[PDB]
Amino acid sequence: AREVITIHVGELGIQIAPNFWKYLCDEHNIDYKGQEKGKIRGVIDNFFEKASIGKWIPRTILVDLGPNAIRKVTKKDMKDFFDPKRCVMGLAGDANLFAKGYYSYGTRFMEEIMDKIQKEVDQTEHLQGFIVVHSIGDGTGAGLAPLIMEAIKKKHPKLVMMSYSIVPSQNMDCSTILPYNAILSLDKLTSCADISMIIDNDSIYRIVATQGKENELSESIFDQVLAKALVEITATLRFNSPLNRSMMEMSTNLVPFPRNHFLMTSMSPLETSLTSAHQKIETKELMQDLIDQDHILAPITVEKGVFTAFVIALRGENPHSILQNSIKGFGDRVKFSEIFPTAIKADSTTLTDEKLARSGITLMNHSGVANLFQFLLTQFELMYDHDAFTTWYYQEGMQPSEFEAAKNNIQKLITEYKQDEY
Amino acid sequence: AREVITIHVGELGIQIAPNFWKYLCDEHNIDYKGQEKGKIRGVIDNFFEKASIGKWIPRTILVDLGPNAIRKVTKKDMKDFFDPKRCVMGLAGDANLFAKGYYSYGTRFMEEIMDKIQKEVDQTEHLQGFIVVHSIGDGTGAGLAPLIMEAIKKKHPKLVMMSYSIVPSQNMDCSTILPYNAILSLDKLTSCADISMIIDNDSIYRIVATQGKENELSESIFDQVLAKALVEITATLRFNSPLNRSMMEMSTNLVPFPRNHFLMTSMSPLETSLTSAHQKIETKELMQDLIDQDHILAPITVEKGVFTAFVIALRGENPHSILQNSIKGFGDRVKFSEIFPTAIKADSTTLTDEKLARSGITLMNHSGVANLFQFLLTQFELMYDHDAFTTWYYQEGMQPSEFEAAKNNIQKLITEYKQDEY
Amino acid sequence: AGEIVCIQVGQAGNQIAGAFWQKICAEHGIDPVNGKAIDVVGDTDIFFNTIGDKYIPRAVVVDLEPAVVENIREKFGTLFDPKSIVSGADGAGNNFAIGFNEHGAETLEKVMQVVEQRVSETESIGGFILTHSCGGGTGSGFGSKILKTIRERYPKVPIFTFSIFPSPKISETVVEPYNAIMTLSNLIKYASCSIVLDNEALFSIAEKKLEVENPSLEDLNLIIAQVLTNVTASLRFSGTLNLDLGKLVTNLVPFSNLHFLMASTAPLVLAGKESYEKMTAKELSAQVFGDEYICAACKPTTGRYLAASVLFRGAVKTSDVNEAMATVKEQNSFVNWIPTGFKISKSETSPKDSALGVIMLGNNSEIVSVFERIGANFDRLWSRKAFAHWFTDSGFEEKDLDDARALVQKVIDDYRKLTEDAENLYF
Ligand SMILES: Nc1nc2c(ncn2[C@@H]2O[C@H](COP(=O)(O)OP(=O)(O)O)[C@@H](O)[C@H]2O)c(=O)[nH]1
Numbered sequence A, B: 001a002r003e004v005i006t007i008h009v010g011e012l013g014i015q016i017a018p019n020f021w022k023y024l025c026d027e028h029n030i031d032y033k034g035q036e037k038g039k040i041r042g043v044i045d046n047f048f049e050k051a052s053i054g055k056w057i058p059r060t061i062l063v064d065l066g067p068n069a070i071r072k073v074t075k076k077d078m079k080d081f082f083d084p085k086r087c088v089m090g091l092a093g094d095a096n097l098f099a100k101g102y103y104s105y106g107t108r109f110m111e112e113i114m115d116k117i118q119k120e121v122d123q124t125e126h127l128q129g130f131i132v133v134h135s136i137g138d139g140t141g142a143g144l145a146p147l148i149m150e151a152i153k154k155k156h157p158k159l160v161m162m163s164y165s166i167v168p169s170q171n172m173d174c175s176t177i178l179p180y181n182a183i184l185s186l187d188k189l190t191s192c193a194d195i196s197m198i199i200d201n202d203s204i205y206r207i208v209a210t211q212g213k214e215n216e217l218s219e220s221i222f223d224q225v226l227a228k229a230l231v232e233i234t235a236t237l238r239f240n241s242p243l244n245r246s247m248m249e250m251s252t253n254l255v256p257f258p259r260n261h262f263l264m265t266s267m268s269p270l271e272t273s274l275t276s277a278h279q280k281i282e283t284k285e286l287m288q289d290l291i292d293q294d295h296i297l298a299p300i301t302v303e304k305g306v307f308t309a310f311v312i313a314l315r316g317e318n319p320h321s322i323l324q325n326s327i328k329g330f331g332d333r334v335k336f337s338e339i340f341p342t343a344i345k346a347d348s349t350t351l352t353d354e355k356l357a358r359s360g361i362t363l364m365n366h367s368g369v370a371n372l373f374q375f376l377l378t379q380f381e382l383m384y385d386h387d388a389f390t391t392w393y394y395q396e397g398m399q400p401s402e403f404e405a406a407k408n409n410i411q412k413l414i415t416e417y418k419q420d421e422y
Numbered sequence C: 001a002g003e004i005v006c007i008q009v010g011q012a013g014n015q016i017a018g019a020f021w022q023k024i025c026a027e028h029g030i031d032p033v034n035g036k037a038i039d040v041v042g043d044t045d046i047f048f049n050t051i052g053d054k055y056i057p058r059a060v061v062v063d064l065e066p067a068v069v070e071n072i073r074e075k076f077g078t079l080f081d082p083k084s085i086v087s088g089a090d091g092a093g094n095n096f097a098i099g100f101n102e103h104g105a106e107t108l109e110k111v112m113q114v115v116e117q118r119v120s121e122t123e124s125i126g127g128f129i130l131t132h133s134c135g136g137g138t139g140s141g142f143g144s145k146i147l148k149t150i151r152e153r154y155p156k157v158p159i160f161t162f163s164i165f166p167s168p169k170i171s172e173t174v175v176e177p178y179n180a181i182m183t184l185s186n187l188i189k190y191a192s193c194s195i196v197l198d199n200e201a202l203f204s205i206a207e208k209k210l211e212v213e214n215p216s217l218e219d220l221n222l223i224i225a226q227v228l229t230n231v232t233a234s235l236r237f238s239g240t241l242n243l244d245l246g247k248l249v250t251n252l253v254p255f256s257n258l259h260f261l262m263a264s265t266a267p268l269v270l271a272g273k274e275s276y277e278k279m280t281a282k283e284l285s286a287q288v289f290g291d292e293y294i295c296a297a298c299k300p301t302t303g304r305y306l307a308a309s310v311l312f313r314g315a316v317k318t319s320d321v322n323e324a325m326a327t328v329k330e331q332n333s334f335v336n337w338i339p340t341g342f343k344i345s346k347s348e349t350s351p352k353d354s355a356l357g358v359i360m361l362g363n364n365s366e367i368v369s370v371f372e373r374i375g376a377n378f379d380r381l382w383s384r385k386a387f388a389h390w391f392t393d394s395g396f397e398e399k400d401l402d403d404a405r406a407l408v409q410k411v412i413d414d415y416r417k418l419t420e421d422a423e424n425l426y427f
Helices: A010-027 A068-077 A098-104 A106-121 A139-153 A178-192 A201-214 A221-237 A247-254 A283-289 A320-328 A369-384 A401-417 B010-027 B068-077 B098-104 B106-121 B139-153 B178-192 B201-214 B221-237 B247-254 B283-289 B320-328 B369-384 B401-417 C010-028 C068-076 C096-100 C105-120 C141-153 C176-190 C199-208 C217-230 C233-237 C245-252 C281-288 C318-331 C365-384 C398-424
Strands: A003-009 A048-050 A056-058 A060-064 A087-089 A127-135 A160-167 A195-200 A262-268 A307-315 A344-349 A359-366 B003-009 B048-050 B056-058 B060-064 B087-089 B127-135 B160-167 B195-200 B262-268 B307-315 B344-349 B359-366 C003-009 C048-051 C054-057 C059-062 C125-133 C159-165 C193-198 C260-266 C305-313 C342-347 C357-364
Touching: A003 A010, A003 A106, A003 A139, A010 A060, A010 A068, A010 A127, A010 A139, A010 A160, A010 A221, A060 A068, A060 A106, A060 A139, A068 A087, A087 A106, A098 A106, A098 A139, A098 A178, A106 A139, A127 A139, A127 A221, A127 A247, A139 A160, A139 A178, A160 A178, A160 A201, A160 A221, A160 A247, A178 A369, A178 A401, A195 A201, A195 A221, A195 A247, A195 A369, A201 A221, A201 C318, A221 A262, A221 A307, A221 A359, A247 A307, A247 A359, A262 A369, A283 A307, A283 A320, A283 A359, A320 A344, A369 A401, B003 B010, B003 B106, B003 B139, B010 B060, B010 B068, B010 B127, B010 B139, B010 B160, B010 B221, B060 B068, B060 B106, B060 B139, B068 B087, B087 B106, B098 B106, B098 B139, B098 B178, B106 B139, B127 B139, B127 B221, B127 B247, B139 B160, B139 B178, B160 B178, B160 B201, B160 B221, B160 B247, B178 B369, B178 B401, B195 B201, B195 B221, B195 B247, B195 B369, B201 B221, B221 B262, B221 B307, B221 B359, B247 B307, B247 B359, B262 B369, B283 B307, B283 B320, B283 B359, B320 B344, B369 B401, C003 C010, C003 C105, C003 C141, C010 C054, C010 C059, C010 C068, C010 C125, C010 C141, C010 C159, C010 C217, C010 C233, C059 C105, C059 C141, C096 C141, C096 C176, C105 C141, C125 C141, C125 C245, C141 C159, C141 C176, C159 C176, C159 C217, C176 C365, C176 C398, C193 C199, C193 C217, C193 C245, C193 C365, C199 C217, C217 C260, C217 C357, C233 C305, C233 C342, C245 C305, C245 C342, C245 C357, C260 C281, C260 C365, C281 C305, C281 C318, C281 C357, C318 C342, C357 C365, C365 C398
Parallel strands: A003 A060, A003 A127, A060 A087, A127 A160, A160 A195, A195 A262, A307 A344, B003 B060, B003 B127, B060 B087, B127 B160, B160 B195, B195 B262, B307 B344, C003 C059, C003 C125, C125 C159, C159 C193, C193 C260, C305 C342
Antiparallel strands: A048 A056, A262 A359, A307 A359, B048 B056, B262 B359, B307 B359, C048 C054, C260 C357, C305 C357
């Protein structure tokens, strides 16, 4: 079993954990106590460790510079599921600064963190890779997640590392220093991860609100959508799928150059509870929905930008003759460079959710990511050039040239993604 | 991008500005702070300047001989949108006299005004023309707008200049010296503008009141209708329309002789908020509404007078076979001279307003304009011949022959427009 | 971890803090006059030291007054631990110089020993909160020496001060502007954040938003206490995502000397079901950002914001927060360089007398008008040297009175310059 180790870093990555792990528990027929619930299905071993007893243990580590995200997750939301010896807690938190997560505070926990990671690594014969789930907003997520990633890559250089980077909103999750942490941490993700998924919370809020225009939803829906997208990305790593069979294949399919690894996603039906009653989603509509504006979890229109890679992973019966006509029917909405064939790959895997006829998710390497980076970079520059809030970072060791370096690296990254636009 | 510079002159032209500019901001998906709000659509560059940052700047100048119209617009109604370095303010106002706007006070501001205009001109590679929005009532509008127009035509003779001339009402906007300012300023518009639109506020008041006979409306409706008519006239200059593509084409389509440039308009549905609930306006009804008495923003019946030119600009799907039957069906309601073919041109462009199935506006070169001019000229003569209020103009330099010249020019203009009537 | 030590200095300080502690004890479920509880909710460890079944509020109670302990037993029962109460010998007669210079070395050493014990019973220090009044003789001068002393012993720890400033119209004593400037000078140098409150604003609120007829200071303190309990909700009720004092300093203070904040809350409800279930986040945001709930003599809708934060409590819908805040961004005025404007947070636990509630804090350039009025009153008295002997015969030099004024003016000039420059930072 090619086993994956999942690490949740920061208050949001931890907030997500109970939704992510409950989906996996139900998907594979395991209860929330780790007990088997009937017949186990899928390659359970890839995400769960088998205990000396009948219990399955999520193969995961929770990291928080304060005590609170972990305390709520392991004591109130999903009791007895997470192993307490795999939880790392600090006391001070991060004061919302990148500087604490990466230079002044979070560094004292690296021996503890790498020790716990090795203990988890030592339990597996065939380790495929790591998934690091983190916010790029707050200092713990923005700071430690790259600190952890670098420590792992220097010890286990042959593994594939994937990050799930969550970009906070400009409204419900906003912060007055968001642009500093976002640029300072993109600068490190650029050299740290092999694959980096970008999920934009503002897209989630407007997409769910659109789907919910007819009803009252639930406040839990925003977290369920964010958690589900990770579960679906990973579906092919858990079931014997004819696609993204392994993290190494995701890397070879989607990332042509070491720096161009930032990926976008699209998902349909977003959540089962959003699409209820008569939901006979025919193979034809599902593929049109996946390139629709209201299914893309980014401020990206596929028609406005250029594709470098595009993989569509469906679940349930999806006849191949339909998938091919749907792709041909994309026309010029899905366009690549003249140095590439229109390398759009699609197929389907096993469905576990008894309420849905079919579903799917896509992974896109598209130039539109550059627009998010430029948005955040412009905000960074307005603040930086007039020293807003820089004293708080300088006080913890961020010599000013550190900010200048991040500024230049991101502008170069934006420039490179837009090369095919010109 | 063929770029247009918009200038708002006088208390009313300035009053209108926030409605005009908000419509454009929403139409092109820009917020009122100049920030982008999703995907930008239409040729944004024609009316907005791009900042060194992500902000769009309205390409406009605000002129007021007093400080107050500008202060309210830029500090209370549409904050941070208008560039303060493009605002020109005097101290004395105009005492409602043409004489101050054109000879004794407004003249001292011409260096400032032309300097600001050049700074705006210098930012654009391809300048199509200018639009001057002004009252013909009050002295600032009636006086400066032609002073400004002459200064521009003598510097940039190859550009097309259009004015949007708003005729004050005989009730809510009335003044005891309205006939002097109206005749004295029509006399200058006659040689200044290439295209001059005439909008009559009395038509707006009776038309809206008719539409509102079933409800309480809003006091803001009168300004929204007046502002919207300009927005719709300009729609073809902002979208890639098959009509009035440029100001030069509006001039060639509508004005056969240098003096016969005064145009009338007709609009339907007037305002979105006036036509709510079930508003499936079929292509057929829209074209009948556009030549109806209750949609013409002038005291003009199309059946009583002669057309020289007629252009119908629609928005939304409008099948051409319907447009042609609607035109043929005009019969003798729409009649031209025996020296012209019935040159009625109609087509449609892009719709941006999600609440309307379709909409439209017409531009008419029709002899009925002569009736408005004669109405105002008769009032001028009754006052002039008995010296009512002439001391106030003579005190600021208007030697008496100046009034006599305007009187004769307008009577000649009326005579010329009515030639085809006989 | 984010444990809080409160310091209460002087009579106003003790009465305001008293109201706070008694409201905290209602939300957590503790007896306000005994400290005894069986079943409590929330993270009580942030503010209380629990021994057996008694919850002991972590506070240092400070006065110069000869019988401060008895004065507390009479109103607060046994809620406060007497070992934490520091009594004085004579008192400071509304004279900053007595609270600051002539206080007695022993008095200050005892206060510091008590503070050390309170910080010694913590796994970590989350911050300090000082409650006081700028026109007094102990809450001004002694409270100021305490900020100096605390910041020297514990640098890099967020100190929040809540203080009462002179009222805009009528004044209390003639000496008040001298006490107010020197207090402000020390707040400028030592606090991480300071919340500016005054009684004129609070009285208008008490008479118009509360149902109470002819309110006294006892009622007025429930508005201040409501600001204090709401600003600490996320700390007390945890949550996966939350706000500590260090989150507020980082997000609201762009420069080290521009930390003076305004505060506003709604609804204001006196104990009992006297409230109405408006249940609308949109209405609460519209109210909290209006001028009518501002707890200081200023008019924020006419100024410009550098930053602001909003904490929503109770079952507030995400969708309403986003729409409500969109309205706020459109109506108000912000400075361009800070491009995101706000810090937004939610805590699902309702205040005890309302299902929903909102607290807002922020940096509004308008705040200088408070400081400018104080400055001008001082300048007139200082030029004539009226009541001045009371400060120079108590250890100050004219130089100290002049330097304190100069520091205050520097802050005013920095807020105003930034605000005026801001108009063109958009072009
Ligand atoms: N809001 C509020 N204001 C108070 C209270 N008590 C006093 N004040 C204000 O605080 C100012 C200074 O008070 P003071 O009694 O001299 O305090 P001390 O000398 O430092 O102990 C007074 O002039 C009042 O304006 C209170 O209970 N609440």
